[PDB]
Design a protein around this motif. Sequence first.
Motif, short mmCIF file in Angstrom:
data_model
loop_
_atom_site.label_atom_id
_atom_site.label_comp_id
_atom_site.label_asym_id
_atom_site.label_seq_id
_atom_site.Cartn_x
_atom_site.Cartn_y
_atom_site.Cartn_z
N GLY B 200 0.81 -1.23 0.00
CA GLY B 200 0.00 0.00 0.00
C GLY B 200 0.83 1.27 0.00
N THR B 202 -0.37 4.08 1.33
CA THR B 202 -0.60 4.46 2.71
C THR B 202 -1.00 3.25 3.52
OG1 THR B 202 -1.24 6.68 2.04
CG2 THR B 202 -1.83 6.01 4.29
N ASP B 229 2.58 3.32 7.80
CA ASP B 229 2.49 4.79 7.92
C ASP B 229 1.71 5.27 9.14
OD1 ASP B 229 2.33 3.94 4.80
OD2 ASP B 229 3.67 5.63 5.06
#
Lengths: 469, 466, 467, 467
Positions: B200, B202, B229
Amino acid sequence: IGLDKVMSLSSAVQDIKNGATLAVGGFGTGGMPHAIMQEIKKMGVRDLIIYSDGAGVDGYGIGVLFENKQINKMIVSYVGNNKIFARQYLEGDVELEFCPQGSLAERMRAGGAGIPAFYTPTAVGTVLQTGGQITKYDKNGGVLKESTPRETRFFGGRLYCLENAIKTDFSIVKAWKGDRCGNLVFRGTARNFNVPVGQCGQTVIAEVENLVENGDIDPDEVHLPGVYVDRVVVPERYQTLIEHRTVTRGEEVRQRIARRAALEFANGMYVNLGIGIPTESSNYIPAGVNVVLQSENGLIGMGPFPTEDKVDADWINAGKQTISHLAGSALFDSATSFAMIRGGHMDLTMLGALEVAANGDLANFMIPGKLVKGPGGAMDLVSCGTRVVVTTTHCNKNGDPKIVERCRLPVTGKHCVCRIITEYAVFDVVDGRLVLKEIAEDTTVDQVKKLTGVGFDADNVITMPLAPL
Amino acid sequence: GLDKVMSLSSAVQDIKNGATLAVGGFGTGGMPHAIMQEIKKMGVRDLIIYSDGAGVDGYGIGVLFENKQINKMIVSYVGNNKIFARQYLEGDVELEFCPQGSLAERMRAGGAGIPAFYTPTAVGTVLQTGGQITKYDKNGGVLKESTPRETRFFGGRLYCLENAIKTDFSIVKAWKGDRCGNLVFRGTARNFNVPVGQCGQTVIAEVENLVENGDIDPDEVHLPGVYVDRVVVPERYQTLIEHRTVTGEEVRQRIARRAALEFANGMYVNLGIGIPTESSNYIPAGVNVVLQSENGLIGMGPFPTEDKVDADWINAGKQTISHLAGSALFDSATSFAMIRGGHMDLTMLGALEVAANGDLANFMIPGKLVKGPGGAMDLVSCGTRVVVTTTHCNKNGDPKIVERCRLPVTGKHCVCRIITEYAVFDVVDGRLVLKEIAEDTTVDQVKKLTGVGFDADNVITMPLAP
Amino acid sequence: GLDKVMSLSSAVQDIKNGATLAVGGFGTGGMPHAIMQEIKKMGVRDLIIYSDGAGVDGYGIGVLFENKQINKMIVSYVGNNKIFARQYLEGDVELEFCPQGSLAERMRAGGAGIPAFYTPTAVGTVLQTGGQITKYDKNGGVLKESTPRETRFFGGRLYCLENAIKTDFSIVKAWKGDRCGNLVFRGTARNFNVPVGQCGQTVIAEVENLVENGDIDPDEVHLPGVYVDRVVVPERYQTLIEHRTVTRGEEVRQRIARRAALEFANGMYVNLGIGIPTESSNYIPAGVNVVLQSENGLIGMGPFPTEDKVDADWINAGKQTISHLAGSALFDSATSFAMIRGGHMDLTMLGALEVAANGDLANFMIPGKLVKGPGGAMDLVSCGTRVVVTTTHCNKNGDPKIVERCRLPVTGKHCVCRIITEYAVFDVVDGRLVLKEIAEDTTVDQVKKLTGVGFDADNVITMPLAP
Amino acid sequence: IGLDKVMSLSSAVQDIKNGATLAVGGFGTGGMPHAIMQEIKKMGVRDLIIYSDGAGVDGYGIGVLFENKQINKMIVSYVGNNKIFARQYLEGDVELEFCPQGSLAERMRAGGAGIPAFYTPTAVGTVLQTGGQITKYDKNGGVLKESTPRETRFFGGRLYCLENAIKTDFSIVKAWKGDRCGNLVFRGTARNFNVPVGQCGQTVIAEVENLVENGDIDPDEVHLPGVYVDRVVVPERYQTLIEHRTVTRHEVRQRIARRAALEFANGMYVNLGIGIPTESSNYIPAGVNVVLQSENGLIGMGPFPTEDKVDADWINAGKQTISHLAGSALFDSATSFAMIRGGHMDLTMLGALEVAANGDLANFMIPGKLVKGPGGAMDLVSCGTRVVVTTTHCNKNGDPKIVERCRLPVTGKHCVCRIITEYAVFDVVDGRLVLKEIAEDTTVDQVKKLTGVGFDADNVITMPLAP
Ligand SMILES: [Ca+2]
Ligand SMILES: [Ca+2]
Ligand SMILES: [Ca+2]
Ligand SMILES: [Ca+2]
């Protein structure tokens, strides 16, 4: 109670036949199964083919095997400080096939994983792609064999190399702890290639510093599930050789380059820093900029050299130097480490260069027919797709520019450098051409013209700032 | 060091309409349920989600179905999910199946900068050729079909090209995380959370326990913090246990009793649910097997005792399970590297149809029972000895042993032995040969009960395990 | 100036057992029968042959089946060859089908130093997936199946990888050759002789007429002599005409032809399959002028010739004698399938055993029962070109030929644009049937009952028919 | 009788809009549609992209379009004697992409043939595979753009380049004869790229020296079937520019040519490049009968013609007027490079700027000074044919030409078998050199200091010469 895979050291190795292909764990001396290597020397097996990150060092792990010329061919990412290895390459006793470190790790994984081939941007447009790297000499300095090219294909408009799965007759691994059914736990950065190596061999042999019973290792703490291991051996305990025993208790343009490079860091960055000026620059990171250092042999959270008490052979950096770790650090294997790097998970990669071009190509890698070491992890680092900054002195000591239109020296990566920091200047590579961004307090644009071997745009130059102490 | 800790609402507020999500979990195990509830509350639509399954009704990704927030699911198995299956058939959701090993590795390749890789998985199936129905309109008719996969030969054998998966968001659940994002998982709740974690742009991690940087041993981190993150510490909740398993059928017993004689000592084995799993309970006197579970365990044991029941320790069929001494846990990319790499010595599965060719159909019947390939496509195509356990005839009198399959093939030329309540077959030279018979029906009566002819010259009598 | 001329016997004597051959000819036209005769005499065994077809019983390649000299055939079409089909069915012969256009281009690629190339032809058929039965045992049991073709995407669509064909020998026939081996061909007897002539290690040509070097205009040479190793001059013989067609109840057929005739527009270049599609070219209305392509290498094909202008070298795709019109042009089989695979036809009209709402078409073989082959149909259906299927709506016996999904092996996937029958005209739109016209004053209700699938019927007009 | 596609020169050209991709026939001036390029200049279309073997010549053909900056980009094999072209690339008004000739022609055919990609060994390991040839400058002589890399794949243990089909909005072609259908006939080596150019355009315009009625071109004599052509134009008669009016009327290189003459042997088909290889043809001894190939589509090439037989349509690869001999044959450029790439030459004899002990060869680029393109050199060297290099032992600057590893950009990798000079003859063996012969009684220590490497001399003789 479970499966028992334990054997004596001689019995575990006795069916390795002449011509066998081996995959061997280890990064330099870290996680290098020296005990098992000593035993295969004893049995005297000949013309081995060996896939490993390096070939250990003189008198240690794989290095041992050159003594009675037991090695036909090495497939390796780096030679390092191994004189017998380089000497036997140059004198025509051994074939030497280079493979970028991350590709070597993923190829071994792939062979364990039933993936016959995969794509990587690593080595694209280098001599490891085009073929012709000198792999074997005759007895009199004559080129006898050359590397076979790699095939390539475009995906999403970028070019990638096809890498082929590596499968071996045997795999030799070292681990901190193993149980009787072959579950292995590793310690520090001695993990490295031991995970992918353990998965790619038909017969895998693991030396353990500590043997425990089945059920002594928390299943949640297993690094190599026992399915992969066939044989476990418990050698008599020995001290892992420390190459660079670095501990915490001229021409300093280097400090000026490092002080400007230090302004590249931003808060929250994960960073990979090469040997020399890039690492030095970490000493000048201002307060309120918190960056995490990555080491390609399998750490994030890398700290300065250890204090005397913390010096540990299992905890070294890419240059084989003893290292500390900081709060929130994390260890991983070499496949995960290059997935991390190849996948662009670094925010900043800072490298030296022997020559760097206006198009963003760079050469360290090698100099052919000369001092030749190998790609290491440099080719993976620069092809990350991530921001790459080169920190290097502006010229060679004899005056020749290191900043050129196009590389004469063999390329490490193609179109990958974003920014070049020298003692005189800071250049951006913008659309395959150079823009002078900064010049040092009292040089001139005019002298930097004369010291660099290409044109550049200079329509908005500022004075180069430096971080304090 | 780094502090990535964040409220639930803030962590997820940046997810926009149309976003792609890779979501961890295997059934409910390691499924970030709390984050999925938050996504429901915020009301984003047109989600495209990659995940092993889609949770179950009222849990995990499942909850996002009920206000129709999901455009497309890319999944290995529907599982026990009625709203998901309902919406696919009625044309409210688009469904692409991906073999589980290929899904996990495509996510890893996404995280690892590997744009594509080859796998023998799914070759010659509808998942490679195209022509699986991925979307219906609202009256049973086909709207969209799966796109073919490319193929390439290596060492005289054909493989599918798989493409990297990269998502806008990845959503992950961990037992513990520290402030800088390092994750440690527990039991088989690890599964897809590692590869999902890596793919991903994020990455959001829901943790059951937050600790300070330096509380986690660097050698015990399963997902390095560089991949995460955002970390969120939800109000603590219990993982939903689908099947809380604790310590006129005879047809399934005898097939399982014959199939237990296939186990040899020192084998690593992957069993299917149903008959292949019950074969383990008749593991004979002096035979040490190690059981693999595709959701990420070797050394799987029987159902736990009542008080040692644990929601993170579940088998492929979503049942609570135990671990035996010497067990090892690993993530789904590693699970299928193990399987696809031929590290199993036996896999034992069931069937809807099995051919004399070695072909096996066991993952759907079009328009009616659609579950997806699961890990079955990987298990059959990796060169591991495959033994199918099944009742000789289906719930009509029609032979489940046919000359060539008519339902969609799970895999081609892959079944080595077939074991039924009446007979046992081997596949030699792409054809069926009778090696055993018991209950003591003669060759002629079984020969009519099967849908194919067969060689039958070295026929012994079939034994059973006690 | 070179002299490659030899006796028939000495030219062929070097073919050892197990040799691979590429052999020219389409049906009987351009088939080197005199050399094939000689190969029979000398009795070589276990041959592997690549050719468009395998001759006919008692002619060309067909002659070699009499003594079981053939191990394996790689062809696009079995045709009127009963020994061939029979020897395949009862396990004497291995038979691998290759789409004609792919077979021609693989031969050329073998001649041209191209190891592989991509084509849309056969994608998603049995010929790409594997599983055509290539070899039976002696009891009608499956021994071998075809190996899969690789596939890659370009520009968002899927293509098959084809490998070059290079053979130990190539055998070609021509109307004319000089001593250094330049060949000139006549009519549609050119076909595969060009690419076949390029792909052999040792290439031998029978010529009907030998001339001295310098007697052929260098601008009229079809196969440059560089390609030819041995030139043979057989004693003269008449090329076998399969169907000597001349100009001089269930007539659903003629209503279909008359409706399909309205698909033609002025300036079209068209390929028409055998049967109804060809009959439709009889009902072309007055202002509509089209050029007919015959896949064996002709544009400008006319109707059957007059009794004394019959010519064995000028035949159509169904092996019938035929004329050519003003402005016609001959080309070889690689070119012919370059034309087709390149989308240069404006309309292709084909028959069907079975046609799907999908736009899939099945019309080339039925496992264990009809041994035909793909011919040019896979190429014809999978290039850019508009495909119209002309077919009787139902089978004899009443089963529908318009089904939801094909049960027989598909010729092409998602390729049919329009379906015309005696009852109806369906279009294929977004992977389903839309009824556009119905016949006579038949009804939407009867056509619903006659079609094996549903369909959209919201702007149905009445079906027109050419005069 | 049939279709009519004839149009005026202005009307045929008027709908070429700005930014258009053109494919243009011709090899130098031979077969180049000059009249059409003239008319296109008149219309004032801008920002053209042009695929053609070359860009004509100053004031001729494509060259006429550089005058008013009408060309954005050229995709070319050779710039060849075009000063306005070379100049606009260098100062930065025209983007120049080099493609090997054989690859260019086959890409166009591929575009015509519905083949999206194919493989070829040509250009493997060169700058044309790896990228990093300069394709566009800025005003200050810096690199604005580099060629993008070609992708590659192994087949049978050997690496090939993937080539992508070329299709363009238009194709412009010249023919000696055309009918109203658009059937074209070419003449001499003026065919060349006109066949594959004619196949690969959406709209294809053909200028004919001679218009005839449908039915007046024998269908067996047609070189581009009328299906490919959309518009046929008949300019006012004009003479094709002859670049080099070479004619047969009534010393360092002579020694190399006489040794090179011994390489010839009875039955060979041979391709000779410009200079010492073409010279060596003069000295073929005895009854040594060879056949000469020109890459522009001729086998049977003879000496420069006698004054009254010069013809602009009969030129060699250096654009020199040429005769042809008995048994000669013409073919288009796609066929020519299939012939070359497929290893149908027995000997290709070439010049060199550098040759390596390796067997690598550099003869096509010298960065900055001579940037004319690969032409057909890359195709000739990588086709596995026996390659022999004829060269002076040193530069014009006095440096050695037999080096260890090529400094200059390579034409082909491990391609050369024999190297022939005035001083000596080397063989490439096991990837290094081995001197076999010397002449004039100069000896094994005199050449060593004149060659740029050491080498083997275990069994050396003296050098025989053709009389
Ligand atoms: Ca093993
Ligand atoms: Ca991120
Ligand atoms: Ca030959
Ligand atoms: Ca056109």
